[PDB]
Amino acid sequence: QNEAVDAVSNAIRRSRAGLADPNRPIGSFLFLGPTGVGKTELCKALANFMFDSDEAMVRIDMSEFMEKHSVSRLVGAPPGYVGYEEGGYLTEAVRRRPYSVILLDAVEKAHPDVFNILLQVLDDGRLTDGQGRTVDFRNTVVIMTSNLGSDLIQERFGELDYAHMKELVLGVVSHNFRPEFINRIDEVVVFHPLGEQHIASIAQIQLKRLYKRLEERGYEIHISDEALKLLSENGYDPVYGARPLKRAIQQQIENPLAQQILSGELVPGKVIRLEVNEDRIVAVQH
Amino acid sequence: QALKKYTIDLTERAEQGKLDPVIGRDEEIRRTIQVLQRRTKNNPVLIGEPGVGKTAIVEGLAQRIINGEVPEGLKGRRVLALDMGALVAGAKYRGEFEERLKGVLNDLAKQEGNVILFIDALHTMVGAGKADGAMDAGNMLKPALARGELHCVGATTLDEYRQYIEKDAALERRFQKVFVAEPSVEDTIAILRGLKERYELHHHVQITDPAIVAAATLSHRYIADRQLPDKAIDLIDEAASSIRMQIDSKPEELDRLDRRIIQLKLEQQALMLDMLNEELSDKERQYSELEEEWKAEKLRNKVTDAEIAEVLARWTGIPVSRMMESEREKLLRMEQELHHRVIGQNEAVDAVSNAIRRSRAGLADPNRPIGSFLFLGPTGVGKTELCKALANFMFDSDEAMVRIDMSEFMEKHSVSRLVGAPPGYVGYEEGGYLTEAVRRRPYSVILLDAVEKAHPDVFNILLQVLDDGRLTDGQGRTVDFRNTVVIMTSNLGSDLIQERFGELDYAHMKELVLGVVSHNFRPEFINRIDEVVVFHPLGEQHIASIAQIQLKRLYKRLEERGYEIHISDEALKLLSENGYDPVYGARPLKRAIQQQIENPLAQQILSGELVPGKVIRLEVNEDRIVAVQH
Amino acid sequence: QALKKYTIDLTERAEQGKLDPVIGRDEEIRRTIQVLQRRTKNNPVLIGEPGVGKTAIVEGLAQRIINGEVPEGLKGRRVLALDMGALVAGAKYRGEFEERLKGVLNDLAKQEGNVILFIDALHTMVGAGKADGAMDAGNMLKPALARGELHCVGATTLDEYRQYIEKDAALERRFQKVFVAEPSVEDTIAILRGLKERYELHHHVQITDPAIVAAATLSHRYIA
Numbered sequence A: 001q002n003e004a005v006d007a008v009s010n011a012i013r014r015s016r017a018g019l020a021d022p023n024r025p026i027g028s029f030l031f032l033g034p035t036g037v038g039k040t041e042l043c044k045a046l047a048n049f050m051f052d053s054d055e056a057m058v059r060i061d062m063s064e065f066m067e068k069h070s071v072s073r074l075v076g077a078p079p080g081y082v083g084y085e086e087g088g089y090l091t092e093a094v095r096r097r098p099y100s101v102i103l104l105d106a107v108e109k110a111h112p113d114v115f116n117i118l119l120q121v122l123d124d125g126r127l128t129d130g131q132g133r134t135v136d137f138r139n140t141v142v143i144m145t146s147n148l149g150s151d152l153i154q155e156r157f158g159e160l161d162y163a164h165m166k167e168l169v170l171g172v173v174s175h176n177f178r179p180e181f182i183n184r185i186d187e188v189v190v191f192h193p194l195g196e197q198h199i200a201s202i203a204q205i206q207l208k209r210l211y212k213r214l215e216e217r218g219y220e221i222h223i224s225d226e227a228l229k230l231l232s233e234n235g236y237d238p239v240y241g242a243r244p245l246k247r248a249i250q251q252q253i254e255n256p257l258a259q260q261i262l263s264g265e266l267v268p269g270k271v272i273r274l275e276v277n278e279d280r281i282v283a284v285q286h
Numbered sequence B: 001q002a003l004k005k006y007t008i009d010l011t012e013r014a015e016q017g018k019l020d021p022v023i024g025r026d027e028e029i030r031r032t033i034q035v036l037q038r039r040t041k042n043n044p045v046l047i048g049e050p051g052v053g054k055t056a057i058v059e060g061l062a063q064r065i066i067n068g069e070v071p072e073g074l075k076g077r078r079v080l081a082l083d084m085g086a087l088v089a090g091a092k093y094r095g096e097f098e099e100r101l102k103g104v105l106n107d108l109a110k111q112e113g114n115v116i117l118f119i120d121a122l123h124t125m126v127g128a129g130k131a132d133g134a135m136d137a138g139n140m141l142k143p144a145l146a147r148g149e150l151h152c153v154g155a156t157t158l159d160e161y162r163q164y165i166e167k168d169a170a171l172e173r174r175f176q177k178v179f180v181a182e183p184s185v186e187d188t189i190a191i192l193r194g195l196k197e198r199y200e201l202h203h204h205v206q207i208t209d210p211a212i213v214a215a216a217t218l219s220h221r222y223i224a225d226r227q228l229p230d231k232a233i234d235l236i237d238e239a240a241s242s243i244r245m246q247i248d249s250k251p252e253e254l255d256r257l258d259r260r261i262i263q264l265k266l267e268q269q270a271l272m273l274d275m276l277n278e279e280l281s282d283k284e285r286q287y288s289e290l291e292e293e294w295k296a297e298k299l300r301n302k303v304t305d306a307e308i309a310e311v312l313a314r315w316t317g318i319p320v321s322r323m324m325e326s327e328r329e330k331l332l333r334m335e336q337e338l339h340h341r342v343i344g345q346n347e348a349v350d351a352v353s354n355a356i357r358r359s360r361a362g363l364a365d366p367n368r369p370i371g372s373f374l375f376l377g378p379t380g381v382g383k384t385e386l387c388k389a390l391a392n393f394m395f396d397s398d399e400a401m402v403r404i405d406m407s408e409f410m411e412k413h414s415v416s417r418l419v420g421a422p423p424g425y426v427g428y429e430e431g432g433y434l435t436e437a438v439r440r441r442p443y444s445v446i447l448l449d450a451v452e453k454a455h456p457d458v459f460n461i462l463l464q465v466l467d468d469g470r471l472t473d474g475q476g477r478t479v480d481f482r483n484t485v486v487i488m489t490s491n492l493g494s495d496l497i498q499e500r501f502g503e504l505d506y507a508h509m510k511e512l513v514l515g516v517v518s519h520n521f522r523p524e525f526i527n528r529i530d531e532v533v534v535f536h537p538l539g540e541q542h543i544a545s546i547a548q549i550q551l552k553r554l555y556k557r558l559e560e561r562g563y564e565i566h567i568s569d570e571a572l573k574l575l576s577e578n579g580y581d582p583v584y585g586a587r588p589l590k591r592a593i594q595q596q597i598e599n600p601l602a603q604q605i606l607s608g609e610l611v612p613g614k615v616i617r618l619e620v621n622e623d624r625i626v627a628v629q630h
Numbered sequence C: 001q002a003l004k005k006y007t008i009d010l011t012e013r014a015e016q017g018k019l020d021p022v023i024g025r026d027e028e029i030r031r032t033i034q035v036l037q038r039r040t041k042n043n044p045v046l047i048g049e050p051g052v053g054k055t056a057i058v059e060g061l062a063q064r065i066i067n068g069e070v071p072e073g074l075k076g077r078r079v080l081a082l083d084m085g086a087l088v089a090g091a092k093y094r095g096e097f098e099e100r101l102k103g104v105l106n107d108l109a110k111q112e113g114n115v116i117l118f119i120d121a122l123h124t125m126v127g128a129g130k131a132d133g134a135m136d137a138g139n140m141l142k143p144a145l146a147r148g149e150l151h152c153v154g155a156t157t158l159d160e161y162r163q164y165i166e167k168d169a170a171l172e173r174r175f176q177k178v179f180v181a182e183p184s185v186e187d188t189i190a191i192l193r194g195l196k197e198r199y200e201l202h203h204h205v206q207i208t209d210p211a212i213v214a215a216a217t218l219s220h221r222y223i224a
């Protein structure tokens, strides 16, 4: 996903050199593209970069707003109503820390009332909450994740350059969203499904954090290259992204390995080598 | 003077060494010292969520002024803590509180600017001592605060700041906001090294440094309620309390056994059939063996990471502890324990067993729940029964689980009955069903039965839940689901599994019914699922074993009434005959047992015919089942 | 003094033999004692839906203190029950609630850490003396709680925990939550055996042990 990391990178580098437009938020993005290709992971890697934590961000899961009356969950309770003295969820959580990252997770699930609220947000950097005061959004990176071009990108990403694909999935978004809300967008970026090499590198990252979990537990693992090849070939299909990799690693390693840890079988200290049998993956002790 | 009566001196307490050491917080102490040395508005307020160390920043400022590690403009300051209740307390008459507060202001003027003041819980001050003749203590310190003549340091919570001080814009702007961010895990470990010294000195135990890094790491992971370092310091302190209690009289295992033997002793005394004298003799022998082992090892004296883990597994309920031998031998025999109530259906018992074994061995993904499951298969084969066997295995009770029947959610409104209502609307003040139920009990089997009956996009709530274990209710507070077991049971391939279960392996069956679910659910949602199992229709030997299960629980139902029943295997073969069809599963067996046994048997009980104590033999008739008295 | 008036001595009542016997609740009293013997935040709170026996846990702790089954660190402690009704009771003049309550804080902290304070209905303490802009019991006790000088065993219902105490998050972090489990059928049978003895002494009757096991079974099954 080189294009999206370029887009977000250039947004923060526009802000730090002063050239940001101070009537808007810093970058209003819309992450399209199919499931399991790292939309929420680019948001998490941003907040990990900029703020030194994975969940140090205003994560709003937009699929809890599927009705017309859940706008008040983020703006606030209007005058003379129940939860009045606590404001909203978005406006307070920004009005505390005005340089934050706001993840509007799974944006298309909600009702278009929230999209009107975010019209005001993405264009002018203010969103007057329920108690009757502005909230300064001129310094937050608003990020939105969706998958409206799932079939289109999964089927036709080959033999097409990036601009024509962007125009085609942007047409699909224009069928889904109003022209207002996609006019306010700083940059729609388009993802792409993962090939063998991408899932191989993601397999190495997930195995590094598996090693880190067992190193916390007190164990070590070296792995065979053939074992990692079986993990990368058992967990490759273009429809579900990089998640069959995660649950394939989860099954084939973590179930028999934890089976043998609980069995009183695998002694601490020794390097637990993960090499293959004919088709299974066995954990050995030598 | 008034400052003797109404202020309690911190630098005298820091000078006599009555304050715990303050570690880190370079940025916030430096900004408090920058703000305290201004010309107008000398007033910092310390703002951050409760537990992050704001009073500790003022106590670190007092210790740095006593040690003299401050600039030269502060060498020799006195930091005096103002107690607004001690001002309010004896002010019965009119104008007594204002006389007290004005005496404090005159004495602070006579100190020639040498006294830093300190009002912890600054939100106490707004509207303190108001009456009809109100000067309110926010309206009398407002001139002395505006002109910078008073060096007050407040320390109020962020929500208490929004509620109480931003309701008064003049006194809102008299104060400079020093934000006190939650310390991360590493800063907490440093803070816990200094407070390790102090807590070791109090509890007379020795906190090992792996227990410190365990306390900061574990309480950052498994507690979303409170904030660092306070939750980590609480794990350290309560762990040292447990170690010192074990040191005092005897360990907790002999405590369990002593309480149980005195309990069953006076309980058998109260019974003066039993199945109690056997239990009491076994527990007395177990007490003798563990007391012999305690005399053979003459124990715990230090706080290790295992004590931190047991304290956190008794704060919450999440099984963080090391597995004892009874529990580990129970848990390696997982599938034998589950096939006592779910006979047949090996694939799902393997899947569920492996998810719980990954949980307990500590390999589970900490950003997701323990395991999501989608039990597909035809009606009456064991889907809801495996979830009840899960709660009866794991939680020792059948109905001890969060059961959300997805056949009440046939409309899109009824997402709101598991997130709660938004602000303004009716059921705001009570929160969601699911979210409150998890926020009480964070380790629980969450079942979503009959899941294909719901509205198609009610499963967007579950996009959040299954992917990241966090669901955000109506009021705002996100509930952490990351230690739960989510299970949704459906029957989307009923006729397919009934038809093509023969001549097909498990893999192609899973693929074909997964195509069926691909026409039902969204590609987002069937990607979140850890493991879709596929159930299989029940055969004749399965139904024979199910008949034995139902007849054992019928004997259990008729022993309470006071009757014994023995059955002959010919009648059991008849119930294997009259209770078999592939299309309806295992309930034709249950209603065949119901009819052909319980209707003539209860007929004959209420007939005044069947004398208790005599064994009711269920031999066969020509075709029926007789019940005789011999 | 002040502790004569605004507190009720449980250990006097347990030592006079006026409380009910308490059966079971072993992990709950053990974690209550593990929380009461801390350095800072000595404050547990018994949470669980009403009926499960939370005041019974604190009275069981009082009977274990008097009859000598607690550790050596608690042999000799008094368990005083604070009266939130008596503290507001006469104070209509300004300050007099706070005068009473800080007199209680003086006379407790002057006991050298001997009196375990008990507040059934902790959610009453939340907004107790909250006058027209004055000091309630929450904001007064709040700094003597997170130094361990006040040993406040709360006992609040779980629904009113969410309604009243989580509204004020600072007083919420001072108290360490001790969950109180709803007991099984079998523990209920044991509880009913001790209280069988006491109710037979009350009503001048006898109670057969089938009526106990039927009472636990039937009340668990049919009253929901």
Ligand SMILES: Nc1ncnc2c1ncn2[C@@H]1O[C@H](COP(=O)(O)OP(=O)(O)OP(O)(O)=S)[C@@H](O)[C@H]1O
Pocket (backbone or CB within 6 Å): A001, A034, A035, A036, A037, A038, A039, A040, A041, A106, A145, A146, A147, A202, A241, A242, A243, A246, B523, B524, B527
């Ligand atoms: N390009 C990637 N690099 C690293 N990890 C990735 C990548 N793509 C997916 N992952 C992994 O897959 C998960 C992230 O998938 P998500 O981006 O959260 O799915 P998604 O992008 O939200 O698509 P939907 O809308 O949920 S179907 C994490 O567990 C990551 O470890």
Ligand SMILES: Nc1ncnc2c1ncn2[C@@H]1O[C@H](COP(=O)(O)OP(=O)(O)OP(O)(O)=S)[C@@H](O)[C@H]1O
Pocket (backbone or CB within 6 Å): B020, B021, B022, B023, B024, B025, B049, B050, B051, B052, B053, B054, B055, B056, B057, B156, B157, B191, B195, B229, B230, B233, C040, C146, C170, C173
């Ligand atoms: N930076 C720190 N260095 C040393 N100890 C700390 C630090 N931060 C917190 N603590 C300890 O953590 C505990 C809680 O901190 P507190 O300052 O008392 O919380 P708080 O700042 O009072 O917030 P509230 O709203 O007043 S409860 C105390 O025991 C402190 O000694």
Ligand SMILES: Nc1ncnc2c1ncn2[C@@H]1O[C@H](COP(=O)(O)OP(=O)(O)OP(O)(O)=S)[C@@H](O)[C@H]1O
Pocket (backbone or CB within 6 Å): B341, B342, B343, B344, B345, B378, B379, B380, B381, B382, B383, B384, B385, B386, B450, B489, B490, B491, B546, B549, B586, B587, B590
């Ligand atoms: N493997 C089994 N072992 C024992 N009893 C079983 C088994 N499978 C089903 N039963 C009986 O089946 C009854 C209900 O079966 P369920 O599994 O609850 O039906 P289901 O699987 O939920 O399918 P639907 O679509 O919800 S009707 C229980 O009373 C059990 O006695």
Ligand SMILES: Nc1ncnc2c1ncn2[C@@H]1O[C@H](COP(=O)(O)OP(=O)(O)OP(O)(O)=S)[C@@H](O)[C@H]1O
Pocket (backbone or CB within 6 Å): C020, C021, C022, C023, C024, C025, C049, C050, C051, C052, C053, C054, C055, C056, C057, C156, C157, C191, C195
């Ligand atoms: N372990 C026990 N030993 C003896 N009696 C008990 C026990 N548990 C509960 N009880 C009895 O159960 C009843 C209720 O106990 P309480 O402690 O009053 O419950 P409770 O938790 O105070 O209910 P609320 O929510 O405070 S009104 C009393 O009659 C007690 O005697």
